[PDB]
């Protein structure tokens, strides 16, 4: 496990999002947190009927690939990941539990280099080394509580650093599974 910034979240089940099909032309995907869980589940039922909110997260990413596929994935959390357009639309700014595709993974839709993401809590998914990457992120904000609907704490970025390669005949799509479990969640202001 990677404990983000060395702090365990302080003061509740696994959620499985849609699988993402990693291909030869894939550029990357990003999910906005906790907006990814607002629309779905009992957790998202509290988010839309409460004023304030605070919670950590336990993001777990898995890739199901054989021994004849190759590639590397960089999974990293970026607190306050603001999008920079070539204003963004709503669907691009806060995509639901379906992420969005990066059009410019080099600048990461924010004018910042992909090469320097390792300064953030991250793990490498190398298909010949491991298929799992789990990151424990605490609550990060300037205030103890914040609105879950109008503000995203961080954005989980999953970018193919090296393209997926395979021989013709093998499965051309590698599913990517993300399982996130809210940890030390709090709510207030029942509306």
């Amino acid at each position: 496990i990677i404990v983000g910034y060395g702090e365990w979240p302080s003061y509740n089940r696994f959620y499985t999002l849609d699988t993402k099909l990693w291909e030869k032309s894939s550029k990357g995907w990003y999910w906005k947190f906790p907006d990814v869980l607002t629309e779905t589940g009992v957790f998202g039922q509290n988010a839309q009927f409460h004023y304030l909110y605070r919670s950590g997260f336990c993001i777990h990413v898995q890739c199901n690939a054989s021994k004849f596929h190759q590639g590397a994935l960089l999974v990293a959390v970026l607190p306050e990941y603001v999008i920079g357009t070539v204003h963004p639309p709503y669907k691009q700014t806060q995509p639901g539990a379906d992420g969005f595709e990066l059009q410019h993974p080099y600048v990461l839709d924010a004018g910042i280099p992909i090469s320097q993401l390792t300064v953030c809590p991250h793990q490498w998914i190398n298909l010949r080394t491991n298929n799992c990457a789990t990151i424990i992120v605490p609550y990060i904000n300037a205030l103890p509580f914040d609105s879950a609907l109008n503000h995203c704490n961080f954005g989980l970025l999953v970018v193919p650093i090296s393209p997926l390669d395979y021989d013709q005949g093998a499965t051309p799509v590698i599913p990517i599974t993300i399982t996130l479990a809210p940890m030390c969640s709090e709510f207030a202001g029942l509306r």
Binding site: G4, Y5, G6, E7, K27, K67, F68, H69, Q70, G71, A72, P105, Y106, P113, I114, S115, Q116, T118, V119, W124, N126, L127, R128, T129, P138, Y139, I140, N141, A142, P144, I161, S162, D165, Y166, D167, G169, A170
Partner: protein, 213 residues
């Protein structure tokens, strides 16, 4: 009263002077600071994080800038890639955060640490030679003289990532070259080309001086 005289250098404004000035709101209390996780106090902590080193800074095309993060290894005693151990000067080290922070300072000195990551099929095997030449030494003419210096023999059938530690740098610079010790051997049904990712960082003894915009 108490007798004093104004020494030379009064009524001047030195933009680096750290003298305490009068508050504009004496009765104001700023909101007390809370514990935000991940507090940084020294930039050396941000210098000691591994970061992608664009060794393959050949392409400049807009739709293929992403190909610079890694350099290919595919199908004997040939030269794969070569780059200088120069964090601050122009080149591949511009991409890493250490090489970007070196542009904010004038002098730096210490030990580097550059790791490589192999991104091939699990059934792919082979060996590669990573040699470092001290400052002044030219690029070796072949693997025979490349092995004589400081080097590591990296086989990626067993270990998928190796670390090469640059002994010492300061602001001629050292050279790092990577050689095909053995050809690229792969089984039937596995991709015939692979990639290597270079992650560069600084050791605990790296320091900087003379901050400069």
């Amino acid at each position: 009263g108490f007798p004093t005289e104004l020494k030379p250098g009064t009524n001047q404004f030195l933009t680096t002077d750290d003298g305490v000035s009068a508050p504009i709101l004496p009765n104001f209390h700023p909101t007390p600071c809370i514990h935000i996780p991940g507090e940084v106090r020294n930039l050396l902590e941000l210098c000691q994080v591994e970061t992608i080193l664009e060794v393959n800074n050949v392409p400049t095309n807009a739709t293929s800038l992403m190909e610079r993060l890694r350099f290919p290894v595919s199908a004997k005693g040939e030269l794969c890639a070569v780059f200088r151990a120069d964090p601050g000067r122009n080149g591949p080290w511009q991409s890493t955060l250490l090489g970007q922070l070196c542009g904010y300072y004038t002098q730096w000195s210490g030990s580097l640490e550059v790791t490589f990551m192999f991104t091939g099929s699990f059934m792919a095997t082979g060996k590669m030679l990573i040699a470092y030449t001290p400052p002044g030494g030219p690029l070796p003419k072949d693997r025979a003289t490349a092995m004589l210096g400081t080097h590591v023999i990296w086989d990626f059938g067993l270990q998928s990532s190796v670390t090469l530690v640059i002994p010492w740098i300061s602001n001629t610079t050292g050279l790092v070259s990577i050689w095909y010790q053995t050809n690229y051997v792969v089984p039937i049904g596995a991709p015939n080309t692979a990639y290597i990712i270079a992650l560069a960082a600084a050791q605990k003894n790296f320091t900087m001086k003379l901050c400069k915009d």
